[model samples]
Target: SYITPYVPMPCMINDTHFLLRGPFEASWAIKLEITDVTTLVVDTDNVANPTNISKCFANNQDERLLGFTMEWFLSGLEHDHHFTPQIICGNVSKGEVNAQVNITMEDHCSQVFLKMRRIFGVFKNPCTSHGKQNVLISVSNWTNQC
Candidate 1:
């Protein structure tokens, strides 16, 4: 027997499956789990199929930022690896007119980059510090524009 769904429900109380035939029965079910559906990966269509899910919560707690790990799949039917973001340095000074933000890429995201945009429709740049792909970004001169 073979059947699978694109999404698996861990909280499914009504789930059941066969392992053998008997006067009683053999069955399997899902229990509670906490995770996003997009992160679940099915490697086969069998009842005993294997799966892959990213469960890593990456962080730079010293910098007060938290990030997650994700499998960068679907670029092909080709499932792939993790992309992590890291913050390097940032600060604001009391009574100072301008502030700075610095970021560095971990897991080789330097070649793949994006920019910073403000919530109030203002735009700023997180420049590659000293330009060597510090993967490092420095958003300069906010000048009390928080």
Candidate 2:
């Protein structure tokens, strides 16, 4: 369970469009994948059979398979937009865990353009054996130029 440092983004869900600068005059598509998992670690005792664990959802089992779709816009331009174009996996669990993110961006410009993507999530482990678990994941200003 190696938790990475959480990063904050400046964009919001309702953010109208993304800002771009330079010689590149085109739209772009960005894709991000995030997976959350739990692990059992002890300083002295050895944990057994930690694999084959069940996956849980925030509300219920039905929502276990969560997905997100985002569109990047350039404010004034209507046709200037990019879609996720792919499905990203989302996992929720209890105990100590970590999240891994993989991102890809597609641009229609010849030059480079500045781009950003924002990610947000809320996690509640609520470990009965121990006490409680609460984790918040937020990413902001995840910028890249291509």
Candidate 3:
């Protein structure tokens, strides 16, 4: 929670990437990247034999792709691109092979954040009771904020 004109985040981007711009952290530049993804497993706590995802009845039942895309608009930190905003895009895989993500932005005493959009395979209703199923994923980070 933060603001001068403070507000909470809206749930408009549940299945899509969220704009990281907020009043919580103050920095001239901000960076966001995906380090790794463990696995996309269904949360079958209430169901029997929840151990094996491949054996689970409702595993990967969603009609969506198991990957995501990200876009970045960096306001320059290099010599040539000093006055230009570097726009970049990449696809993030569900595995470790080709998930090369590094989005950064630099500004002149201005508020900074990452504009990450385009998400996939994210569910709206993540509740389950032996019949309906839920999925789980995790992300790790190293923070040394300036």
TM-score, per-candidate, Cα-based: 0.18, 0.20, 0.16
Q: lDDT per residue, candidate 3, 1-146, as tens digits?
A: 33223221222234322223222332211123332222222233422221221122122222111111011122122223332322212212333221112222223111112222221223332112122221122121213221
> Top model by TM-score, which number?
2
Runs with alpha carbons beyond 4 Å of true place in candidate 1:
1-81, 94-107, 114-132, 135-146
Candidates in order have lDDT scores of 0.19, 0.23, 0.23
Q: Which stretches of candidate 3 lie over 4 Å from their true place?
A: 1-80, 83-94, 97-146
Which runs of model 2 end up more than 4 angstroms from their true locations? Answer: 1-82, 94-102, 108-146
As a whole number from 0 to 100, the lDDT of residue 32 in candidate 3 is: 31
Query: 1-146 in candidate 2: lDDT tens per residue?
Result: 54322211222332222222211222222222122232222333222111111121132222222211111222122233442211112333332222121112223110011232312222221221232221212211224533
- Assess candidate 1 and give its lDDT: 0.19
What is the C-alpha lDDT profile of model 1 across 117-142, one tens digit per residue? 11112222323333322221111221
